[PDB]
Amino acid sequence: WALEDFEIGRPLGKGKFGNVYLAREKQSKFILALKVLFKAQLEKAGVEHQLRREVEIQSHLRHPNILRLYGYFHDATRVYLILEYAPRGEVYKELQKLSKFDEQRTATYITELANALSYCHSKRVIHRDIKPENLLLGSAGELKIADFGWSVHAPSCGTLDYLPPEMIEGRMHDEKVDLWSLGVLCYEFLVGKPPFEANTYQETYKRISRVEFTFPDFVTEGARDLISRLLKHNPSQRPMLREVLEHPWITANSSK
Ligand SMILES: O=C(O)c1ccc(Nc2ncc3c(n2)-c2ccc(Cl)cc2C(c2c(F)cccc2F)=NC3)cc1
């Protein structure tokens, strides 16, 4: 695999630590997304074990709702990451443009996530980094999990918003950590922003540690219940996916 097997299209993103361009595999005209990385910024951060370890995990996962990593290859000074391309764009931007999502749209995204996660929780992998900007949209408008920068094996410093008390209180945690994010996320899908939002890192900790959230009046009781069930402080109180997938509100509003 050489960078000359591909035809770079329009840029879709920037980082940290390279760029993501549209691209067409020359011989098969196969459309995809290609992530670039400079070995320079790589060792300058030393996170090379992660890249190898993250690419490691993602490369061995199969799900309609999990963005696929076909392959990769490095050259003179670059690292190349051959990724599945998501036509409809990023869920984050969408939320930005619409402000929030009606119950039907929210309820379905959750159902798709629940499966993708139910799946990960059986391959013994925990995402832990579920957040809008980690979600993209398939051409059919369906949800796709994109990043694995953290996702680890278990039972086992950035944005504190989607992390549960255990993660934050440096405590011992497991697969139920993702069920807390699903709650937070659900809330954001419906409210327009996270439950434990704060102008300061410090005070978010407090809001999250003490599980302090309230709903806007417009939030329906069907939702409030689910979210509340999902945002239980004690990881054991956190329901299990099946139950989530089979919650009244979920069923009464989902497409799947
Ligand atoms: O603006 C539009 O109209 C638009 C934007 C994007 C798409 N599609 C798309 N499909 C697949 C990927 C990406 N984007 C993508 C794009 C940019 C960047 Cl900075 C990262 C990635 C990723 C990614 C990743 F590796 C880690 C974490 C998150 C990721 F999102 N990986 C594949 C369609 C339309």
Task: Mark whether 24 and 57 lie in a shared domain.
Answer: yes
d(CA 138, CA 146) in angstroms, rounded, equals 11
Give the number of domains in the chain. 2
**Rounded (10°) CA dihedral 192, 193, 195, 198:** -150
Identify the domain containing residue 65 by its residue range: 1-89
- List, chain by chain if needed, residues with CB within 6 Å of any ligand 1 atom: 12-13, 20, 33, 35, 67, 83, 85-86, 89-90, 134, 136, 146-147
Catalytic residues: 129
Task: Mark whether 35 and 121 lie in a shared domain.
Answer: no
Phi, psi (deg, nearest 5) at residue 63? -160, 140
Terminal Cα-to-Cα distance of the chain (whole angstroms)? 38
> CB burial class (10 A; 0-12, 13-18, 19+) of residue 58?
buried
d(CA 49, CA 157) in angstroms, rounded, equals 18
Reading the block at residue 31, the tokens are 């459309």
Within 13 A of 188's CA, how many CA atoms are on the CB side? Answer: 23
- Residue positions forming the annotated binding site: 16, 35, 84-86, 133-134, 147
Determine contact, residues 181/151, Cβ cutoff 8 Å.
no
Reading the block at residue 170, the tokens are 């440096």
Determine contact, residues 85/24, Cβ cutoff 8 Å.
no
* Domain end point (choices 74, 89, 104): 89
Within 13 A of 99's CA, how many CA atoms are on the CB side? Answer: 1
User: CA quadruple 180, 131, 203, 214: dihedral positive or negative?
Assistant: negative
Ligand 1 mean position to 187 CA, how many Å?
A: 23
| 3-class state of residue 223 by DSSP | helix
Instruction: Give the determination technique.
Output: X-ray
d(CA 92, CA 191) in angstroms, rounded, equals 14
In terms of DSSP bridges, do strands 69-74 and 78-83 run parallel, antiparallel, or are they unpaired?
antiparallel
Reading the block at residue 161, the tokens are 């918003």
Header resolution in angstroms: 3.3
Task: Mark whether 56 and 94 lie in a shared domain.
Answer: no
How large is the C-alpha radius of gyration of the chain? 19
- DSSP-derived letter for residue 119 is H
* Domain end point (choices 33, 67, 89): 89
**Which atom belonging to ligand 1 lies closest to the Cα atom of 133?**
28
Ligand 1 mean position to 20 CA, how many Å?
A: 7
Determine contact, residues 178/171, Cβ cutoff 8 Å.
no
Reported for 232-235, long-range contacts at CB under 8 A and 24+ positions apart, including other chains, are 233/165, 235/164, 235/166, 235/173, 235/174, 235/176, 235/177, 235/180
d(CA 16, CA 41) in angstroms, rounded, equals 8
Identify residue 221 by its one-letter amino acid code: E
Query: Which residues make Cβ contacts (< 8 Å) with residue 7, sequence separation at least 6?
Result: 23, 24, 26
Q: Helix 103-120 crosses helix 177-191 at what angle (to 10 degrees)? A: 160
